[PDB]
Structure 1
Amino acid sequence: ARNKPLGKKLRLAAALNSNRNPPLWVIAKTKRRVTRSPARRHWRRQKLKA
């Protein structure tokens, strides 16, 4: 929406900050054991209930 309340906006900000895979050096550090993040999502598929 165009007209957002700040509280909702800050929950959207948190989801934006967490939506990313582990860095490449983490994959190296863990010998490829850690390659995915549970916070990884796509805006079209996994919907936030914000």
Structure 2
Amino acid sequence: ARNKPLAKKLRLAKALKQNRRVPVWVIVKTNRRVLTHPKRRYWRRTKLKE
């Protein structure tokens, strides 16, 4: 929305920062056992809890 409160904006910012892929160096360090995390999200498909 055009008008937002700061607390909601900060929570949305935290979710935005969370939504990213696993580092490639993490993948090689873990030997391909860790390839993803449960916080991956698609804006038009998976909606935020808020």
Superposition TM-score, scaled by structure 2 size = 0.92
Equivalent residue, structure 1, for 2:28? 28
Query: What is residue 3 of structure 1 aligned with on the other side?
Result: 3
Q: Which runs of 4+ in 1 moved over 3 A?
A: none
| Alignment RMSD | 0.7
Q: Which runs of 5+ in 2 are unaligned?
A: none
Q: Considering Cα pairs closer than 8 Å and 6+ residues apart, tell me whether 1 or 2 has the greater RCO.
A: 1
Distance 1:9 1:46 in 2: 18
How far, CA to CA, are the matches of 2:10 and 2:32 in structure 1?
33
